[PDB]
Amino acid sequence: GEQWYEKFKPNCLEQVAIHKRKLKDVQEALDAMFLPNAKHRILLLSGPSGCSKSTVIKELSKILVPKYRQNSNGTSFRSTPNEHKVTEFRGDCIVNDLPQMESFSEFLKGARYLVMSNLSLILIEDLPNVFHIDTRRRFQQLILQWLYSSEPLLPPLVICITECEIPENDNNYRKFGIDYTFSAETIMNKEILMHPRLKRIKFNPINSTLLKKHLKFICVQNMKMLKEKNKWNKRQEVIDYIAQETGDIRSAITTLQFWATSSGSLPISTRESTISYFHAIGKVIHGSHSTNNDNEMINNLFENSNNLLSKEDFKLGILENYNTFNKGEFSISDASSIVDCLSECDNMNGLPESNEYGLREVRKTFRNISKQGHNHGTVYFPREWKVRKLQNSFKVQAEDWLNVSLYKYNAVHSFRNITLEFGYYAPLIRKCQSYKKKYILYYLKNLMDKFSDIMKVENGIDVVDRIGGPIEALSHLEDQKKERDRRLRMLIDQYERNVMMEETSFNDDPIVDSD
Amino acid sequence: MKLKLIVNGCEAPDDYKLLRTTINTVASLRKTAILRFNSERLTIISTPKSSGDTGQLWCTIPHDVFRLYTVISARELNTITMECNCDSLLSVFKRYDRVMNQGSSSNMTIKLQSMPEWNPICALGITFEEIVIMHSFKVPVKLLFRAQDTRIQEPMINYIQLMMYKLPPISGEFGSAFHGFIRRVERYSNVNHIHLMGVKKDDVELKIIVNELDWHLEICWNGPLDSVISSTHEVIIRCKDWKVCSKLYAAFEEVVLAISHDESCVFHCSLDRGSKPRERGQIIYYIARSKGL
Amino acid sequence: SLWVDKYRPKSLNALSHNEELTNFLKSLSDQPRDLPHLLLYGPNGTGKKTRCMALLESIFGPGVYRLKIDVRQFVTASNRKLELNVVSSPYHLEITPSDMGNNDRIVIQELLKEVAQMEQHRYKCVIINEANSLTKDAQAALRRTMEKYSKNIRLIMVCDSMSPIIAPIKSRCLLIRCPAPSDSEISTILSDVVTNERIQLETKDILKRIAQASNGNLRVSLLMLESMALNNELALKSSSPIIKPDWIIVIHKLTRKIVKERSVNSLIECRAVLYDLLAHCIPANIILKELTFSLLDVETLNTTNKSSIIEYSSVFDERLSLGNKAIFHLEGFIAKVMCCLD
Amino acid sequence: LANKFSASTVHLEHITTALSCLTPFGSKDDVLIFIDADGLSFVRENNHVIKIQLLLSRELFMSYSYRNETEDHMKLCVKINHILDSVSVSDDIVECTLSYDGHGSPFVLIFEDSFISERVEYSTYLIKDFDTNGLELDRERISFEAIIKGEALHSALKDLKEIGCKECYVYAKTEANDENVFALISKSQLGFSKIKLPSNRSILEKLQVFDGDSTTVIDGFAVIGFFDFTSFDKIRKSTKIASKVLFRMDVHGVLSVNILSGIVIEVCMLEKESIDEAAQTEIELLME
Amino acid sequence: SLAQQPWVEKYRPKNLDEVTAQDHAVTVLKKTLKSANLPHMLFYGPPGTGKTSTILALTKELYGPDLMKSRILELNASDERGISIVREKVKNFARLTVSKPSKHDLENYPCPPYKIIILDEADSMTADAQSALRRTMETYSGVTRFCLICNYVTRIIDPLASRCSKFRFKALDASNAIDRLRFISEQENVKCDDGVLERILDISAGDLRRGITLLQSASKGAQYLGDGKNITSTQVEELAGVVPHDILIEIVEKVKSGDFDEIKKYVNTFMKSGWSAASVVNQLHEYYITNDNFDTNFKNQISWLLFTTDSRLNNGTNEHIQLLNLLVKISQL
Numbered sequence A: 001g002e003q004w005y006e007k008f009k010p011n012c013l014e015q016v017a018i019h020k021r022k023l024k025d026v027q028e029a030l031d032a033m034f035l036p037n038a039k040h041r042i043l044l045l046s047g048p049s050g051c052s053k054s055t056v057i058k059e060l061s062k063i064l065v066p067k068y069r070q071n072s073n074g075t076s077f078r079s080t081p082n083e084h085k086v087t088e089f090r091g092d093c094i095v096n097d098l099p100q101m102e103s104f105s106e107f108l109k110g111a112r113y114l115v116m117s118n119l120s121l122i123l124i125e126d127l128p129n130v131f132h133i134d135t136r137r138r139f140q141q142l143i144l145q146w147l148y149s150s151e152p153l154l155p156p157l158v159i160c161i162t163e164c165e166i167p168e169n170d171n172n173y174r175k176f177g178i179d180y181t182f183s184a185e186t187i188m189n190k191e192i193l194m195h196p197r198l199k200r201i202k203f204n205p206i207n208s209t210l211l212k213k214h215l216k217f218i219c220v221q222n223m224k225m226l227k228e229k230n231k232w233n234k235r236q237e238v239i240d241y242i243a244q245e246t247g248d249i250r251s252a253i254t255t256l257q258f259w260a261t262s263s264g265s266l267p268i269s270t271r272e273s274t275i276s277y278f279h280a281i282g283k284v285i286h287g288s289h290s291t292n293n294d295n296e297m298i299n300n301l302f303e304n305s306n307n308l309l310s311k312e313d314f315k316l317g318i319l320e321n322y323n324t325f326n327k328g329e330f331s332i333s334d335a336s337s338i339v340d341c342l343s344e345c346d347n348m349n350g351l352p353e354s355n356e357y358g359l360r361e362v363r364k365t366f367r368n369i370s371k372q373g374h375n376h377g378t379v380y381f382p383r384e385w386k387v388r389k390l391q392n393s394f395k396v397q398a399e400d401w402l403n404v405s406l407y408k409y410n411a412v413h414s415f416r417n418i419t420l421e422f423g424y425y426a427p428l429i430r431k432c433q434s435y436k437k438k439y440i441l442y443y444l445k446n447l448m449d450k451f452s453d454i455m456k457v458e459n460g461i462d463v464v465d466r467i468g469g470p471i472e473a474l475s476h477l478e479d480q481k482k483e484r485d486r487r488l489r490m491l492i493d494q495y496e497r498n499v500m501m502e503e504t505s506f507n508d509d510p511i512v513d514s515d
Numbered sequence B: 001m002k003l004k005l006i007v008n009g010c011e012a013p014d015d016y017k018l019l020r021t022t023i024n025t026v027a028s029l030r031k032t033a034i035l036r037f038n039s040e041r042l043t044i045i046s047t048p049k050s051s052g053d054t055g056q057l058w059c060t061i062p063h064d065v066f067r068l069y070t071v072i073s074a075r076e077l078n079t080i081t082m083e084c085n086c087d088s089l090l091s092v093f094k095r096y097d098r099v100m101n102q103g104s105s106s107n108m109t110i111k112l113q114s115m116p117e118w119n120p121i122c123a124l125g126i127t128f129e130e131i132v133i134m135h136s137f138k139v140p141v142k143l144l145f146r147a148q149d150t151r152i153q154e155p156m157i158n159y160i161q162l163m164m165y166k167l168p169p170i171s172g173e174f175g176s177a178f179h180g181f182i183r184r185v186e187r188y189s190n191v192n193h194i195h196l197m198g199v200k201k202d203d204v205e206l207k208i209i210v211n212e213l214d215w216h217l218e219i220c221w222n223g224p225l226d227s228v229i230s231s232t233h234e235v236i237i238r239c240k241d242w243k244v245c246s247k248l249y250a251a252f253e254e255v256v257l258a259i260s261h262d263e264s265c266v267f268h269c270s271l272d273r274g275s276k277p278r279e280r281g282q283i284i285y286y287i288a289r290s291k292g293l
Numbered sequence C: 001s002l003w004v005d006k007y008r009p010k011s012l013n014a015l016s017h018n019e020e021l022t023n024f025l026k027s028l029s030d031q032p033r034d035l036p037h038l039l040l041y042g043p044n045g046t047g048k049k050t051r052c053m054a055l056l057e058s059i060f061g062p063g064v065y066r067l068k069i070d071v072r073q074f075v076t077a078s079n080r081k082l083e084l085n086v087v088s089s090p091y092h093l094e095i096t097p098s099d100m101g102n103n104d105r106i107v108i109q110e111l112l113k114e115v116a117q118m119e120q121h122r123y124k125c126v127i128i129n130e131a132n133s134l135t136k137d138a139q140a141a142l143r144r145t146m147e148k149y150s151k152n153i154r155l156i157m158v159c160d161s162m163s164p165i166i167a168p169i170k171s172r173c174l175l176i177r178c179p180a181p182s183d184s185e186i187s188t189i190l191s192d193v194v195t196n197e198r199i200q201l202e203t204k205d206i207l208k209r210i211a212q213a214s215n216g217n218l219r220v221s222l223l224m225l226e227s228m229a230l231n232n233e234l235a236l237k238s239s240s241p242i243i244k245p246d247w248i249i250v251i252h253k254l255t256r257k258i259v260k261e262r263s264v265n266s267l268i269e270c271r272a273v274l275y276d277l278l279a280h281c282i283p284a285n286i287i288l289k290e291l292t293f294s295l296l297d298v299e300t301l302n303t304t305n306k307s308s309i310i311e312y313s314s315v316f317d318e319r320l321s322l323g324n325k326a327i328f329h330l331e332g333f334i335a336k337v338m339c340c341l342d
Numbered sequence D: 001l002a003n004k005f006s007a008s009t010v011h012l013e014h015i016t017t018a019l020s021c022l023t024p025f026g027s028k029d030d031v032l033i034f035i036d037a038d039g040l041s042f043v044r045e046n047n048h049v050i051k052i053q054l055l056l057s058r059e060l061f062m063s064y065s066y067r068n069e070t071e072d073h074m075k076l077c078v079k080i081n082h083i084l085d086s087v088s089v090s091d092d093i094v095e096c097t098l099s100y101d102g103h104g105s106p107f108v109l110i111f112e113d114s115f116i117s118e119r120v121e122y123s124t125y126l127i128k129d130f131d132t133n134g135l136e137l138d139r140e141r142i143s144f145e146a147i148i149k150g151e152a153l154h155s156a157l158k159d160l161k162e163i164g165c166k167e168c169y170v171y172a173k174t175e176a177n178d179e180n181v182f183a184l185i186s187k188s189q190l191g192f193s194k195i196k197l198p199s200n201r202s203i204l205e206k207l208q209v210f211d212g213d214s215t216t217v218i219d220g221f222a223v224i225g226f227f228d229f230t231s232f233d234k235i236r237k238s239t240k241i242a243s244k245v246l247f248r249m250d251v252h253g254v255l256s257v258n259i260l261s262g263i264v265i266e267v268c269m270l271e272k273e274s275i276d277e278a279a280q281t282e283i284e285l286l287m288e
Numbered sequence E: 001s002l003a004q005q006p007w008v009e010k011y012r013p014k015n016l017d018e019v020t021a022q023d024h025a026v027t028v029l030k031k032t033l034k035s036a037n038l039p040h041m042l043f044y045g046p047p048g049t050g051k052t053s054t055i056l057a058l059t060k061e062l063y064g065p066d067l068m069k070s071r072i073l074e075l076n077a078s079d080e081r082g083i084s085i086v087r088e089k090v091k092n093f094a095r096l097t098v099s100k101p102s103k104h105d106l107e108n109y110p111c112p113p114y115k116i117i118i119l120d121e122a123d124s125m126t127a128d129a130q131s132a133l134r135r136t137m138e139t140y141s142g143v144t145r146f147c148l149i150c151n152y153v154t155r156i157i158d159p160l161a162s163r164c165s166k167f168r169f170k171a172l173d174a175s176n177a178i179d180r181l182r183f184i185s186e187q188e189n190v191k192c193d194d195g196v197l198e199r200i201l202d203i204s205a206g207d208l209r210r211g212i213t214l215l216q217s218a219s220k221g222a223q224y225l226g227d228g229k230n231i232t233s234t235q236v237e238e239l240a241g242v243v244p245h246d247i248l249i250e251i252v253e254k255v256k257s258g259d260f261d262e263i264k265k266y267v268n269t270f271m272k273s274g275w276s277a278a279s280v281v282n283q284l285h286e287y288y289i290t291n292d293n294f295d296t297n298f299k300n301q302i303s304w305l306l307f308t309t310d311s312r313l314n315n316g317t318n319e320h321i322q323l324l325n326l327l328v329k330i331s332q333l
């Protein structure tokens, strides 16, 4: 009755289908996190389904927690030694007097106490309802508070996130990041991921060797029924098929059990694996080995990976990486045709068949010039995000310059003019005026009316650098926003003073607590 | 910088009620409030601009309320500006109110203390007894810079385009009737934007309207309404603002109303005190045109 | 202060170029009661905003030039915050809905309508900068707002191109063409500026070069004259080099690179320069136009190459107009030009 | 008055209490008002499966004038946005007057106090082609009829509402030696719960299970009616003010409830299409 | 308002009797004055053809000033017309009973038993919102009538076009609206040469609003001049923005002498003057098509070239690039 993937579970760390390097890295990181004052506070494990994240975490906990757990002096709840190596959060718990969004908080505020004599590894695999915006914000805030907390002691925190796609559903119309992919990036934020006290280790699909070994072990364990049903002599091939069909150990074991239990002969199938972004780009550019008909491959990709192929990110990636075919040494006519096709697809208002046309054109063009003697380049993510960030910084700087101009010279200009001519001419003029002001001041000191206009240039307010930086071609935002706010406040104060016409201060007069 | 205030609910109940009303009103509008402790009076400000749109509340309490009032600072007029969470002070004030209701003569002592255990951030050490159990509260607060305090200013209302309306005392024979008049519109579900109108020549009359493609609500007042020493003055305001005004009217006696046509609404409350007469504490509420004509 | 603004004329009579437009503005201001909605279209840098301000001054006195700034918050359908710096005066109002991108329609529905309903008896004047950048929905919403409340407000709009303006708006507005200043007028203005600034000059020909390097835009003319004067220690010589905007030089260098290397790797290298130019918030359309007309100035290319270049430029300009992302079309134009040149 | 229909009264509390029984029928629906010399009738229909009809008698109104001799009655329709709260209302007496002048004019309600004057106007709407009188009980064939106290029924309905009832079962049975059984069986997240009324006369007075004929009473046959609790809970407010409740089930499965408090409320609700086998088995087990 | 409103706003038709060139539909709208049988209406036509004025005058005639405010619900693009609005507000208004008319309006006005909903600029509504209006337009037709006004009939979904009687507002030219402009000029005491009004109508290209605005501008210029001289065609052309014939001749000469450098230089100089590409394209089309000095094949090619360039311009493209490409392409031919 018991399913094999549960019946044949690892009993020790040596039976986990995990590569040696990844296992060693996880061991080292987790051991470091268990130290009295550990630099790392959270272990973020991300990977596909059935890659043995929770399994390896539990197996390592079973060995590590007993080593560091401080001995008790009869303070255990029950006579038992409190076999609670791992404490996990349950997302479907509904207590009476508690709002739903506050559930995880109530867990975390308890988890902090599982240290020293009550040491326990905090595992977060069943996440709260992060699809709810408010719940996700609360979860992120709680994680940040844990990272920025100020307690001398905290228990190790492990978050295992199974990265998977969210199929396009009718009941959902929003198009946020989490609505497309359920991964660490969409669940967490930049601040948490980039925190110095958080360590992220990415898991990989289980390789064919480990899958074959474990499937062979499972088959050897069940020998009576396999021999009786006359499936032993042909077991190997089946295992091989599984080994080359899926990287999910649980799915592989389920498929093996389903095949073995069947009295007749049913075709062997496993769960489908989504094609990654770079894998999809490679399929579109260089083709697929498993298929020779391009039409069939493209139809399968569109039917199984419509969500990934519909976004403009895939089109931008194709535009960015189409030149890596032969390191760029291929006919320019093919590149022109590809780019023209992508441009014309851009005008089709994101219809699915526009994407079909673009991908099929790229595939046909690359197949036409395909040859055995080809050397490829490196695939890179398109840099549209960097351009957007630079544009945002430019907008902030232009707003700051406009505020300065308005509040110091009674001049209002369009942002278009700032982008076109002012953003280069004005900083240069201010810089040269400041240089001449320094020269004149030094000359006068050594020894204003002649160059009173130059004397009116203030170095602390007037912008003397090109907006957005120099154009380096052919030879973060919070700080700029705060600087703009400070300059705006200073300008307002100066304007008010003209109209009518400080922590050091607090430190100089400490409060007096006289009773 | 030294801050020390002593309050006794039993003595001068009227000013204690004034403080209760100010705290409740500020806590029922937003999350944080500005407290300016001056050598002469205490100002409590609830404004959107902190450290149509929502209205603003300004409460002035004379220094004579506090039995002990020690305010020392290095700034002009010994002004100390603070930003405090309304909920914490409101909870402390409920605790003190129930302690007094139980029956006691204890005094509430408020001091400003520095917190090295935790824009400097300090604490208010509100302490009072309860017959004995010592009640202490360290309410977090943020010290506000002189320039930032100067930024916040009282709104100014034109006095040539504005006409004042005197309301009957709550303790008078018409007080209950006028309170019911005010609350008439606080029992309709979908109503969110009421339309106040004032007509000159009962010397003056005040009406409340709600116009909709399906509904037409209209409430008249027939009692004697006086005008404080041309007949078309209308303003549309949210129901929350009217409810706040309703709650305010139930506490004070010399309540005054003003409608700046299609501009705003002003709700003034004063508390007379005998002695020349002592400084008159005030509560002024400004409401912006929710929709407008 | 910048010489562009500190010399800004503050009256219609002060204008010294395009006397016909000045006379037309005088005629319009002669009877400021039945002034229809105005739409001033003309090349950038001509002085359209200056002329609008001069007309407003001539009509409503000198309070218009006393500008004030305020912050007006906007809430969209999705409860999204929007901030538009409202430039207002006691006699007029100014707005640039283009800064709100595709949300400009809300400004048309929540700002213009509310103020139009309010009654001032005279009317208020509202200026919309960069009218051609308005989305079609905003232009459609403007129609009945203008027609119904013409008693209270009269609308003034400014643009560099009437092509993106829907037919109803052009029907509802009085069109005013603003010709750009000629070389001689720019030279005279620069001569006055240099004379008043006590700056030294050798020959008037330099000014002509300053007129040529700008070729109509007076703002850049004055900016670069100031830059040259300050760089040369307030001594403008005949051999003093002309300072151009950095992106212009970058585009010319990119054009030279395209001409020299017609290869895939050349396209890849040019992609980075295109990204940098876009990251400097330079519009895609102006990038395309400047690249096209820098390529058309190459002497090596023949008539057929130039004709193909202009054809591709027009096609990809249409694609940019109808497209969402701009990189595709710029890269396609460059690739097709390189293919034809090879 | 100079109007086709004009009524005035001082017992505003009774009218407000009676009108408060129309809240549970939603806020996006409409209310039909029938004006006649006999009095006022308020009709609501929901989902074409439940209907409520409240009658206000002439004697309740202090003064009544119906000058529309052309037609013996007038039909009008009003949207229930928040009309329930409007007619809700200190020491001084308040006079409530209703005015209506033919079709095309607003229904006007005016409250007169010592110093406060209220007037509210409601616009009328085209009478829905749907006939609210299509749902009625056939008197010829009544499966059973029961008389119950309002307080007990209100308590039972409140109990079902608390447990989040999803489906309701009305079970009626009459046996020998004066044995009467009336029960409500709720299917909810709790499973199956049962609330049975007592045989005491003070609570449960008098019962028949006719089996369909309204003439002969048989003993041993049980009548079971399956309802959606959404419709069944719309009579709880009407039952709160009830002084007596008359239940009637016909062979067709329509439930009729008469609520007597001189204001009478008649409610008709339909029965669900079919009964699942598990529900019937649980009913049998619970009643054994 | 006599001297404080724009001429277009001051001369808006008040009654159907003064609508100039829409008899084909104005007669139908008039004969239903006493019919109580007004159907759902879909007015479609180019800008400034007299669509809003017609419906406003019709409402005034049928209901009158007092009853108009209660029997008319007007929505336009400036108002938010989402699907929720169509479902709730429009449906509620349509289902409402017509307000009882007084004695005076009944005595003096027909007071039909139905109200009117005017969805001006309906072409800006989404397809789903239009769909939500289908059965509402039919269920409550006994007490409500719908009016949809648009410039692009294709933007209206087929079911609504089927549910509504369609009226096409024809373009107004010198042969359809000369009388109205002449009346306006006479009442404004505007002096002009013979044929000036015809030229203004032709420039308007089927938009009496543009003609009236141009006439107002010409009158203002003449008054400022104060010379007591009739306005000539040159002034109206200059204020309209039409490129002078001399510039067109020079452009044609440059195009004929095929030279990319000279053509591009002249195009840059011309476009540095602020002229609109649409006007010059229209003038070039007129000059080329009406000329008999060119072969049939050249006209066949140039027609498609001009059509493509005009379509590009309507999309909001750079006028300079498009004009240069057009001139070069014609030069090649």
Ligand SMILES: Nc1ncnc2c1ncn2[C@@H]1O[C@H](COP(=O)(O)OP(=O)(O)OP(O)(O)=S)[C@@H](O)[C@H]1O
Residues within 6 Å of the ligand: A005, A006, A008, A009, A010, A015, A016, A017, A018, A048, A049, A050, A051, A052, A053, A054, A055, A056, A161, A162, A214, A249, A250, A253
């Ligand atoms: N040799 C093995 N190594 C690892 N897991 C095994 C092995 N044999 C059986 N299993 C089971 O296979 C399943 C997959 O391992 P898991 O760690 O649960 O997968 P996962 O990384 O957690 O992915 P998700 O998020 O749970 S779908 C578990 O239930 C294991 O108990």
Ligand SMILES: Nc1ncnc2c1ncn2[C@@H]1O[C@H](COP(=O)(O)OP(=O)(O)OP(O)(O)=S)[C@@H](O)[C@H]1O
Residues within 6 Å of the ligand: C168, C171, E007, E008, E009, E011, E012, E013, E018, E019, E020, E021, E022, E045, E046, E047, E048, E049, E050, E051, E052, E053, E054, E150, E151, E180, E208, E209, E212
């Ligand atoms: N048939 C007409 N008779 C008289 N004046 C007219 C006529 N058509 C237009 N006009 C004038 O031009 C103005 C245009 O007003 P409208 O009737 O709103 O134009 P329109 O047909 O609505 O154009 P669109 O489609 O809204 S851009 C009117 O106010 C009149 O002054």
Ligand SMILES: Nc1ncnc2c1ncn2[C@@H]1O[C@H](COP(=O)(O)OP(=O)(O)O)[C@@H](O)[C@H]1O
Residues within 6 Å of the ligand: C003, C004, C005, C007, C008, C009, C014, C015, C016, C017, C042, C043, C044, C045, C046, C047, C048, C049, C050, C051, C189, C218, C219
């Ligand atoms: N007639 C004129 N005389 C002198 N300077 C002018 C004149 N017209 C414009 N300018 C100058 O040109 C500069 C920019 O003009 P701008 O208003 O930006 O034109 P546009 O509105 O077309 O962009 C102004 O700072 C102004 O000083």
Ligand SMILES: [Mg+2]
Residues within 6 Å of the ligand: A053, A054, A055, A125
């Ligand atoms: Mg797991």
Ligand SMILES: [Mg+2]
Residues within 6 Å of the ligand: E051, E052, E120, E121, E149
């Ligand atoms: Mg119109």
